[PDB]
Amino acid sequence: KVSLVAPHQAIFTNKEVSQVNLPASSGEMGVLANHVPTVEELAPGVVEVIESSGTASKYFVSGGFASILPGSKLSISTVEAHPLDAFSSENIKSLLAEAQKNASSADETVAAEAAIEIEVLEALQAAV
Amino acid sequence: IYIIGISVSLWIGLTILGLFLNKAVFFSLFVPSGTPLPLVPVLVLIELLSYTARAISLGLRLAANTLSGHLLMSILGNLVKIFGLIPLAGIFAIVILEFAIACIQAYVFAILTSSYLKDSIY
Amino acid sequence: QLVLAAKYIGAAIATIGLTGAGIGIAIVFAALINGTSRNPSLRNTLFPFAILGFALSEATGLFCLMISFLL
Amino acid sequence: LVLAAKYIGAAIATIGLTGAGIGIAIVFAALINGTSRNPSLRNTLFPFAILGFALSEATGLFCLMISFLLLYG
Amino acid sequence: MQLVLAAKYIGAAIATIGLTGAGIGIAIVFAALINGTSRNPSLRNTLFPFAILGFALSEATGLFCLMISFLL
């Protein structure tokens, strides 16, 4: 029973799931059957929802809020949800190199935005 | 009251061990759970050994409650020799806690016997 | 005089076990006070486990005090 | 030997004060931190702190009676 | 025998120091069970079997220490 709905399309929609190893704000947690109501935020990681057997879909979520209701309902509301095969390895290396050179080189919000983008690009490249 | 409490508690402890042994003659199936090793036979500090420790709580609670109430003789000589009104408030709180301890001790004895009846039929 | 001197020290060293019974009554009450403010364990529910749980922790101090006062 | 053992009975029996002293602070730490979460103020948490402190302080009063009885009786 | 009678009273006093582990052990299992029963889920099952079986195992240390103190 998962309700992973994004702001453009619905993935889980209906309650037809079991396990959901989605990355929250703390660590790489995983929702089981009737988990506790933990409405914590989600970070940019890998939201692999194990459907019964080994039919897990590696959905590379960019962050959001994993709301857990008291009636065994996991509403993982994120911004984006793309698969692991939808990211080319050639274009992923160009974005990480441009963010590292722009970091600690200017002022205002240029150095702050480049530091957060380098951490999300390094975690997605190691899970390919 | 002290000698009668220990003798009555010993008869209730022996009935719990005899009832579990009689019901295990038609089912048995051991009593412990399986694991990855084999050291559950040496930890036989329950069932039969747990009946002597559970029955001793009734006799130990009667001796501790009687010792607190009998301490008023040593405090009465000092108050009749600060103000002595502090002894009236302390004796009233100890008497209310001793009377309320009988309901907690009776519920703890009934909760221990309920786990032995459910485990013997499973 | 050797038997009378050991009787007075038997009730002093045996009273060291009050640290577990004294802190045990406050440890069960600290978790029940912090959990009752999360709505809405008040009447019964958590009141039965706190009253029954305090009697189990107080059994160690009551049994240890009987051996010290029997000298 | 009887008079020398009476003075040591009131000193070794005072080791149980660590449980009674730390018990009053353990119950007060949970009540102060829980009251700031809105809004356990009137009664509720305030009434349970007075009744809960009497159970933790019962170990200190019972242990002190055995130490004072050896020096007077 | 003055030396045998003096060691008998001291044997029941130093052996009673083990009540700190048995007294605080029954309260440690009750504190974690009371804070977990208020949310997800009930208290009549699941955690009820662990609290009854867990309290009997932690209380076994107090029964063994009290038996050697009363026999000396």
Next chain:
Amino acid sequence: QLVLAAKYIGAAIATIGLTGAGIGIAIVFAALINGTSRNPSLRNTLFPFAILGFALSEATGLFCLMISFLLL
């Protein structure tokens, strides 16, 4: 002889209770300092429970020190 030497030991072992009274003032102050930054328990409210709770925890140190000074 025996009564004079036992008077010095009556105030040494009885001073072991200062660990409970000393750590009690720090446990109540740690929860009050960390809870005051959550906005806005400042005047009264949390200040009344911390002042009254510190006096009750300090009673164990004053009561244990009376038996040490009476025998020394």
Next chain:
Amino acid sequence: MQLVLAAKYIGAAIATIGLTGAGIGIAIVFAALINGTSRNPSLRNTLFPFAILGFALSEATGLFCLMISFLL
């Protein structure tokens, strides 16, 4: 002997002080298993196998310390 009989009673009382570690060890594993099972769903397996194996390792200290007390 008077000196041999006096040391036998003090050995069983001093060895009983180790019950605080064995009694609190069974409660530490039971507190984490009761609160950990409420987060779903290791109840009859996974965490159930580690609780039975973990309790046997902590109980080995109490059985080894009690053997030297009864033999002295």
Next chain:
Amino acid sequence: MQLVLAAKYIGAAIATIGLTGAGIGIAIVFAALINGTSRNPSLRNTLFPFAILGFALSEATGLFCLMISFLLL
């Protein structure tokens, strides 16, 4: 005479057991004040008055216990 002189040295040794509560009490109040100051915004005053006053109350157990050891030595 000889028994009173030997007991004076042992009186100042066992009385120093209370330094564990007073020594760890000065660090318990400083650990919560350092971790709570970075949570916005218990810095100037507010929590600064409770940390200075709370440290002197916890340190009173060490100075009171040390007076009985110095008086018997």
Next chain:
Amino acid sequence: MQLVLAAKYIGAAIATIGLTGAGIGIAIVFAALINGTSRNPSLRNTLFPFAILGFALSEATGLFCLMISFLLL
């Protein structure tokens, strides 16, 4: 040989005080491993190697302290 027999019996009991550190060490590593395994998904291997190796390191204090008690008896 009365002084050697009395001191040998007290050596096996005083050396048994170190069992509190070895007994609580096996439960401290088991409590963190039980709570971490339920958070998904380190179960088989991976984190199982640190728990098995960590229990053997904490048990070395109990086996070394017990050798001095058995050698003097």
Next chain:
Amino acid sequence: MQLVLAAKYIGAAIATIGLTGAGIGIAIVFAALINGTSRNPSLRNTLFPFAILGFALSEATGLFCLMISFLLL
């Protein structure tokens, strides 16, 4: 002076029991400062002044208890 000479050596050993409170106090104040500095951004001053001042207060119990042991030797 045979009884006073033997009690002087045992007085300096039992008085060193207070090192457990002073030794653990330096690690308790450093644990909150290391874990709190990673929360952005208690680094320069702010929490650095409380860590230096808090460590000196907790270390005062170890230096005061050690003076009574060296004076009886």
Next chain:
Amino acid sequence: MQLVLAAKYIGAAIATIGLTGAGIGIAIVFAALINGTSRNPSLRNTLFPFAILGFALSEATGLFCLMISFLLLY
């Protein structure tokens, strides 16, 4: 020399009281490393290097205290 032989046997047993700090110290570093490895993603080295070096510092208290106990009985 009955006084020196009796004090040497009690010195090796009283010095073993320090095993509580060294035995529990190896489990405190292992509990934080096992709970922190599941939070993603420090596995090889990084956090594993601090557990090996941190265990040697905590074990120095048990080895130094055991040397004074064995020297009095030998």
Next chain:
Amino acid sequence: MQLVLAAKYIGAAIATIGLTGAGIGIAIVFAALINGTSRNPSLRNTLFPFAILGFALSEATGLFCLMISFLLLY
């Protein structure tokens, strides 16, 4: 002699009781440093400087207490 030799051997064993605070202090500072380093990215310096300096202050209690025990037996 006699009473002076027996008190010197028992003094080195009772003085080793302070190793519990120094032995557990190395594990308390290592547990907070290992768990805090997983938040990204306190690696080089920063947390490494506080852990190295904090371990030296906690180890001073064990080294100072061991000097009084070794001086009485030598």
